[PDB]
Amino acid sequence: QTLLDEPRPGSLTIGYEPSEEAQPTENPPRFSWLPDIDDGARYVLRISTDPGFTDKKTLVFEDLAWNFFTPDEALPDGHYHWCYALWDQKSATAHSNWSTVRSFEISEALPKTPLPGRSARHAAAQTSHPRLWLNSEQLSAFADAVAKDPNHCGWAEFYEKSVEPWLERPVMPEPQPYPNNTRVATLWRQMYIDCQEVIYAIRHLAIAGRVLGRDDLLDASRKWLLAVAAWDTKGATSRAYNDEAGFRVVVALAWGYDWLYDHLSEDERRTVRSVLLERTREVADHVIAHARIHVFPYDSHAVRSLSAVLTPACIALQGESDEAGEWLDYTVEFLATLYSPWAGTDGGWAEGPHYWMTGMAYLIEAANLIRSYIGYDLYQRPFFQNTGRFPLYTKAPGTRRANFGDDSTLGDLPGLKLGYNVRQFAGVTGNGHYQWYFDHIKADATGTEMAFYNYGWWDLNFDDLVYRHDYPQVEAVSPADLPALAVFDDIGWATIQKDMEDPDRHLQFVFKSSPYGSLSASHGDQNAFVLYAHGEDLAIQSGYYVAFNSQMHLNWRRQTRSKNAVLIGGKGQYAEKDKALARRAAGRIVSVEEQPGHVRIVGDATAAYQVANPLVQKVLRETHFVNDSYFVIVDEVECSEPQELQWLCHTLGAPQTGRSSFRYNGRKAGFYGQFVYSSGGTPQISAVEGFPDIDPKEFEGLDIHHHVCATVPAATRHRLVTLLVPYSLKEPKRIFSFIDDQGFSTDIYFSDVDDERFKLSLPKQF
Numbered sequence: 097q098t099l100l101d102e103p104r105p106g107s108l109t110i111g112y113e114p115s116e117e118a119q120p121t122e123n124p125p126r127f128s129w130l131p132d133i134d135d136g137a138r139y140v141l142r143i144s145t146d147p148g149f150t151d152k153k154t155l156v157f158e159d160l161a162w163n164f165f166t167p168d169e170a171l172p173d174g175h176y177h178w179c180y181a182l183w184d185q186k187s188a189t190a191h192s193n194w195s196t197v198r199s200f201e202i203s204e205a206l207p208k209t210p211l212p213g214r215s216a217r218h219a220a221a222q223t224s225h226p227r228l229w230l231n232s233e234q235l236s237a238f239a240d241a242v243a244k245d246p247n248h249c250g251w252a253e254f255y256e257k258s259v260e261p262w263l264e265r266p267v268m269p270e271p272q273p274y275p276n277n278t279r280v281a282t283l284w285r286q287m288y289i290d291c292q293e294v295i296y297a298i299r300h301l302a303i304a305g306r307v308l309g310r311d312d313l314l315d316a317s318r319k320w321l322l323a324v325a326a327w328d329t330k331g332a333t334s335r336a337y338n339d340e341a342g343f344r345v346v347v348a349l350a351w352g353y354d355w356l357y358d359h360l361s362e363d364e365r366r367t368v369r370s371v372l373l374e375r376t377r378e379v380a381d382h383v384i385a386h387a388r389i390h391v392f393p394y395d396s397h398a399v400r401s402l403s404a405v406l407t408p409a410c411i412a413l414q415g416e417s418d419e420a421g422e423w424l425d426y427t428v429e430f431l432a433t434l435y436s437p438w439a440g441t442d443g444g445w446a447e448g449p450h451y452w453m454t455g456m457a458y459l460i461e462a463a464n465l466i467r468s469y470i471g472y473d474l475y476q477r478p479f480f481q482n483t484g485r486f487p488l489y490t491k492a493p494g495t496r497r498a499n500f501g502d503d504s505t506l507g508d509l510p511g512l513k514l515g516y517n518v519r520q521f522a523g524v525t526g527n528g529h530y531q532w533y534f535d536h537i538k539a540d541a542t543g544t545e546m547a548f549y550n551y552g553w554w555d556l557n558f559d560d561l562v563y564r565h566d567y568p569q570v571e572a573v574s575p576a577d578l579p580a581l582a583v584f585d586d587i588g589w590a591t592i593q594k595d596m597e598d599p600d601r602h603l604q605f606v607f608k609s610s611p612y613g614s615l616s617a618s619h620g621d622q623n624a625f626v627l628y629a630h631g632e633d634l635a636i637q638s639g640y641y642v643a644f645n646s647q648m649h650l651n652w653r654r655q656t657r658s659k660n661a662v663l664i665g666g667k668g669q670y671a672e673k674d675k676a677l678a679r680r681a682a683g684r685i686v687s688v689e690e691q692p693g694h695v696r697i698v699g700d701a702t703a704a705y706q707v708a709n710p711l712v713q714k715v716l717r718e719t720h721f722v723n724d725s726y727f728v729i730v731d732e733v734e735c736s737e738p739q740e741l742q743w744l745c746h747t748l749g750a751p752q753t754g755r756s757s758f759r760y761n762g763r764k765a766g767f768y769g770q771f772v773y774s775s776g777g778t779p780q781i782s783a784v785e786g787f788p789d790i791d792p793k794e795f796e797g798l799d800i801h802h803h804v805c806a807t808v809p810a811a812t813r814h815r816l817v818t819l820l821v822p823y824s825l826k827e828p829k830r831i832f833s834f835i836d837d838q839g840f841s842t843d844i845y846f847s848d849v850d851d852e853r854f855k856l857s858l859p860k861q862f
């Protein structure tokens with residue numbers, strides 16, 4: 097009987113769940129632990145209300161292939177205890193000391209979301225092709241329906257634009273390797289787009305052929321499928337060379353193989369399955385064995401490739417490989433148990449909404465396919481119940497620069513897929529605000545389908561068909577009753593929405609101080625804010641996407657100097673490629689407090705600044721939303737030494753600067769900021785043009801943004817207070833302030849022209 101290794105968790109590993117430190121949000125709980133030393137090992141899990149773990153009251157789960165698990169039945173309410181051990185398969189017995197006992201509590205309030213076991217899952221799975229989206233009877237049923245009404249679920253609209261143009265198009269030549277094997281943005285993007293079109297051709301032609309009973313469309317689909325199965329698996333389009341191209345090729349193969357299964361000949365099936373299996377193997381290895389996301393979960397493309405690649409492929413391949421059976425099980429068990437590391441059940445997505453767009457787009461697909469293949473519904477999990485509200489409060493219709501993180505679209509109106517995603521969650525939740533969002537996004541963004549981040553990723557005519565065939569037709573509800581404030585505690589994101597339905601009065605505000613630091617898609621932007629008020633973008637996310645690994649990306653957008661945030665001694669929060677440091681350079685939402693006409697968020701970004709500057713000791717920002725009109729921002733910095741303080745805000749146009757203020761006027765809206773109190777002395781205020789140090793070529797023929805730079809002279813103690821008053825340009829607003837400093841605390845009294853007052857009571861220590 098061996099000793100069990102119970103390693104101490106790390107910042108970039110999974111944790112031990114559930115515990116007193118992390119109560120379960122689902123019934124039955126999601127169980128994860130860090131693996132034993134013996135990389136080839138199987139586990140046994142004990143659960144009991146009895147702290148002594150007696151037979152009568154212990155549930156036992158044996159032969160657990162993985163170091164994470166979800167039981168197939170919910171638990172009765174009460175106080176629980178659990179522990180795990182090594183399990184010897186042949187001897188059918190535990191063969192190591194049991195783990196530390198951890199405790200958790202079950203209540204009736206917790207969603208009941210069991211995961212059907214492998215036996216169940218395998219037995220409910222169909223064995224005949226097709227399997228993806230529709231099965232054999234569903235196809236026949238649907239085909240009869242199309243014969244009766246050619247516009248069923250919008251079929252002919254799909255046919256007209258997503259099927260027909262493929263008939264007159266030459267089969268996509270196999271993409272070439274990059275000149276010198278040096279990844280170039282242009283060639284990398286084009287290459288994955290090339291492969292995306294191949295998904296479209298194969299998948300749409302095949303579906304059409306079989307829905308319409310048309311041998312000529314299957315032949316067109318086959319011609320594409322075979323040309324592709326013939327591409328070099330170790331060539332350019334490998335996971336290794338360009339995983340974006342790679343992912344896509346697999347998907348196409350999966351669909352062609354699944355829907356042309358009967359149309360292919362003996363060889364053609366074997367030629368295809370052969371090429372499909374090997375390509376899927378590259379991904380499956382990378383995800384399970386290489387990155388090992390059940391240990392190191394913070395891998396963007398790996399996590400994503402679960403739904404985007406593994407799900408369609410493993411379903412295609414079932415019964416034709418025991419590896420695929422294993423891979424599917426991992427994929428389903430992961431999505432049910434550990435998905436997603438970028439989120440908690442609050443619905444927020446740490447990578448930002450834009451990554452939420454892609455991450456969900458694919459999950460939806462996998463969620464759907466899974467539902468359709470084996471009946472299991474991931475949508476019942478709290479996170480998916482709630483996640484629809486994330487783009488609602490962060491990518492609200494009309495907003496261009498009012499959120500955070502890497503954004504391919506930065507500057508455009510919110511992307512179509514955000515709408516389309518939300519509608520899916522509408523369909524699942526019955527929430528009409530979601531259906532409102534879809535409508536308005538879809539409308540504001542028509543004619544946009546052909547942009548690289550849309551065409552290169554999804555076909556909306558297809559996503560539309562899938563939805564309309566599978567889901568109810570939810571009604572829109574005016575977002576007027578939507579609560580102003582939504583806090584996303586699991587990621588450290590606070591948002592405010594006002595009058596979302598009114599383009600003159602619509603306000604979007606988000607403040608972010610995140611325990612994810614500048615890891616993956618996040619930037620060095622803890623204690624940062626963005627402000628879209630009165631129907632315009634005022635305090636913006638600055639710069640352009642340009643390309644991943646551009647200078648604009650790495651030395652501007654990733655950096656604090658591009659945020660609405662402070663600099664300390666001219667230094668910002670760590671935003672380089674080392675992810676341990678990145679995750680260490682974090683902040684958090686200390687507290688949120690709400691009462692009529694006064695919201696207050698407090699963020700601690702102390703760690704974030706410390707990583708690059710050991711002199712920093714305390715970094716607090718308070719943000720006040722006063723009487724649904726204006727903002728008071730409090731910055732409190734303590735160092736071990738005099739350190740200069742720098743306050744930044746970013747705008748599209750040039751800002752005008754006062755002795756202790758600044759003013760920006762956009763096209764229909766403007767705002768001003770006044771530094772009313774600064775314990776470190778009066779700040780010198782500069783307006784900076786452009787993007788210093790950023791290669792002028794990367795934004796050539798684009799509009800240069802501006803930013804203000806309020807600089808307080810060196811001090812070991814900073815207490816800065818900034819009044820922010822946004823306004824409709826038609827109706828400019830002014831707040832008056834008064835300082836009652838003398839005393840234990842420094843008091844500041846604000847009021848408007850109708851003498852409605854606000855009291856800021858600020859202690860002198862923090």
Ligand SMILES: O=C(O)C1=C[C@H](O)[C@H](O)[C@H](O[C@H]2[C@H](O)[C@H](O)[C@H](O[C@H]3[C@H](O)[C@H](O)[C@H](O)O[C@H]3C(=O)O)O[C@H]2C(=O)O)O1
Binds near residue numbers: 617
């Ligand atoms: O560049 C695009 O055309 C693009 C379109 C999509 O809208 C999406 O925003 C896409 O984002 C991906 C990006 O191109 C890179 O692949 C990047 O990959 C990184 C990865 O996600 C992770 O952060 C880690 O640091 O590795 C990176 C890498 O060098 O590959 O992000 C992609 C993503 O996962 O969204 O950009």
